Subunit: 294 residues, 4 copies
């Protein structure tokens, strides 16, 4: 569809006082597109949605859509562990001109499969734009089974794919069998994007592409062209950065990395915190390996 390739899970930059840095964000989103990013996810996991006010949440989406200017799809984060709240966020994303919404499995309250089916069927029926399921047991603890995901694709037209952050690559095969070959599967993990694409993925909603949008865009292009030899060469270049970016909790690593490129301030909101020196040095080394700094 339009949902393929390297799609950046955008950091939300803050200034030296913790306010939304709209100026850095505008320049950053433009840089991303110039470097070959195929899509943008504002206010996701990596955007520190939890610490944004309701107004900041709306504003980051609006600015993201305005700078994109139709050049690349905007898949707005619209996640909540409250079905009524996720409806409101998804409708506001659509009204604001989002191309699609990314809707996480409810976190903290740990619903069963019936509850997941109800949550996703009610959210997608509230809107007219495509919905991507965001399955991340490592943050929501519960796990949408391929069977539940199949029931939702069968029953709901606008459920078009998954951000699959299970890190269990056999799921790509099971989801392909049950949801079909047209079901849009996007890696939710940078380090396993390569194998994810071999099992039938068509892209990655990426943290690393915040830092290396061009190499990540080329890596994804290589996978979609079937040039796995080139993709593996690019994996050898990026894997140190895939690893170093996650030594500390996301998006501490990415925000340090983007500050080291001079593009944002190294600032996060409690309970997220700046990385220690030792992490910062492993991220610098990984950025040299990848050729992003001399």
């Amino acid at each position: 569809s339009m949902l393929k390739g390297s799609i950046t899970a955008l950091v939300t930059p803050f200034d030296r006082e913790g306010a939304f840095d709209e100026k850095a964000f505008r320049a950053f989103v433009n840089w991303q597109i110039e470097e070959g990013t195929k899509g943008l996810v504002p206010v996701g996991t990596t955007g520190e949605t939890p610490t944004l006010s309701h107004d900041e949440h709306k504003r980051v989406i609006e600015v993201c859509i305005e700078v994109a200017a139709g050049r690349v799809p905007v898949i707005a984060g619209a996640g909540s562990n409250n079905t009524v709240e996720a409806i409101e966020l998804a409708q506001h994303a659509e009204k604001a001109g989002a191309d699609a919404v990314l809707v996480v499995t409810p976190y903290y309250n740990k619903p069963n499969q019936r509850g997941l089916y109800e949550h996703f069927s009610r959210v997608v029926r509230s809107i007219s734009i495509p919905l991507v399921i965001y399955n991340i047991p490592g943050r929501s603890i519960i796990d949408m089974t391929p069977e539940t995901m199949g029931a939702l694709v069968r029953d709901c037209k606008n459920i078009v794919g998954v951000k699959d952050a299970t890190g269990k690559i056999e799921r790509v095969s099971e989801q392909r069998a049950i949801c079909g070959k047209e079901f849009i599967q996007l890696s939710g993990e940078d380090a396993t994007a390569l194998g994810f694409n071999a099992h039938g993925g068509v892209g990655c909603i990426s943290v690393t592409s915040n830092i290396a949008p061009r190499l990540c865009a080329e890596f994804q292009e290589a996978c979609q062209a079937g040039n796995f030899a080139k993709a593996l060469e690019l994996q050898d270049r990026l894997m140190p950065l895939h690893k170093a970016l996650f030594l500390e909790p996301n998006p501490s690593g990415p925000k340090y990395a983007l500050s080291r490129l001079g593009r944002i301030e190294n600032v996060l909101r409690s309970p997220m915190v700046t990385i220690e020196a030792a992490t910062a040095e492993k991220i610098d080394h990984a950025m040299k390996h990848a050729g992003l700094i001399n």
Copy 2:
């Protein structure tokens, strides 16, 4: 000191339309106190806080405090994964007349120990009433270590105890060694409340006490008196209900059980859902075993 014994993690009742059933809640809170419940936690995990609006959240606390009428402590749930939001909730709980606040580890965003330290030190310094740390890796994934908990009690006077939902009983011993004997340890799990108290717990923030407040009050009294033989007799009576209540996701089991006593409607907010018939029958059997119904 007032934080001892059986403390009910209150369900939030909804009517046949999903509105706050204030009438059922008032009668329920009163029944709980009459049956010997030693404290109340409104808008905690079992209260479906995620699906309450800001106004419903305020109202459940206000009504809880009003009905309590100083007869037992009210420990208001005041959790967020956003430090600024948790400050605002804790201050509002204090202004409303709460005796203390229960503040969960940030869920979803997975901060490190420094982030936890910052979160809890800023929340407790924003207020003048006691704070209880709520450590629940099974919902927030990350885990406040005894060491980090010790640092917070050492540095912050008004951090007075923990709701410990780790299910790892050796933590009670480690928290007692590092946080001290005066540190108030309350079981976050019904089924291991007994062993929890043997290691130095002085009570339980309980789901089962929603259904069997009097037997739960006696069980806790027996532990605090040192009559572990009586506590074990009461465990033989309560354990099938401890188990049957959690066959399906909390608080679906409890809400069915309380509807079977005629005290609420069997109604939850998406993505939480009513239990299957088979579960309902295992909860009826466990309630018969405990002598709550014929």
Copy 3:
């Protein structure tokens, strides 16, 4: 029957050349009994059974029985992931004059519940002395459910009890409900022995009792008398040693500790290795806290 209280999971001492140190072992088993140990398990987890030859395996059991001289029960380790091998080990233990056998859940090959039922029913029917199930998911990965345990106690006369190393104290309650109050439950973990007994345990197959047999014997006696207040005072004394002994893989910690008492050489067989200096210092400090050394 006489399976109660502090039962030592004996280390197998090696000399400076890696041979079985039979002289240190005979003095150690005698010391254990003199200090009030209520039972002995030779060639278990803590005995490095995997690195003993078939002849060394037979000899450690024989020496244990010879020194015991009927003063305390010997529960010989007779564990294998091969049912035919476990039959042969249990029969050899019985012929050698063991009072009972400790038989682990098969490790590595990960059988289902039917396979566990078959394993334990065939081994216990091969012998005429009591059998204790050893349930340790932390080493064998699979987990005998309370239901499977129930089936085995119900159907096999000589299956009398469990060494429960799940660390999940709600299992003691579930096993008591299904297997009955007369079913002999022994903690498989030192740090949760206390809570284990509160839920209906009658003792602990202990690592710590290798080092502090007398304090561990008194702690267990206190629990069996219903003096949980005294048991908790003894927990305050023992918990730093419970922790320091397991900083590094069992039995590295215990073997260093027993060498520091002058009772064995600090020698293990590959792939087990001696502890680091730093660990050794945390073990010394824990031994001072407990009053075992000046």
Copy 4:
């Protein structure tokens, strides 16, 4: 070391009395080679090594080598949680004429990284044929880190590759970075063989290839040729069988499947047991899908 492609983790057939079925095994090993299997692992996890006597262990290796007749490499299973035992097994495998040995991380006794280093360095130094590390946390619980694996490749000439059963595909990238590009990485999981190869794997030590040697050989050939579109078509054909074969514990599924092809008796040694009828029907359906039976 042309250890590449589909390498079968051979079942050990037993007759209706539980004895080694040498006649079925000879015909099976020959069939495997005729169908394009590139290598053979006798007496591995899938061969029920735990339940083989010392003489049966030697015999299955000897028959495997004799039937192979130099046509494909034989990588003999030589695993133990005892370093001295693993030495003896590896030397005997070499004396019998094995091309290489597969040596599992010690199970049950849970050594640290020093213990793993010592275990593998002593085993490989005892022999003069190549050694493949078998890293399987799902059976041994402990996990050789890429750093420990790199130390062993740096220090030990004959450590040539890994059977990687972590199911964590980012390990392939990390092992390639630290152990180098010539380090032979073989998938330890059938379901993720495809992505494993995309990250730099050159084959799979396979369970499924017991049942579909030809399709598994083609799948691996497609990956090694860089035809990932063909490999993915073959994944769509094999994945239901990759799943159905592991509904019940390995090798109960494979043994039923091979009995349904008429090639062995459906017979396992305790504690492994024949699959239920229900599983057998899901395996039949998966075998129909793959075109192995009508």
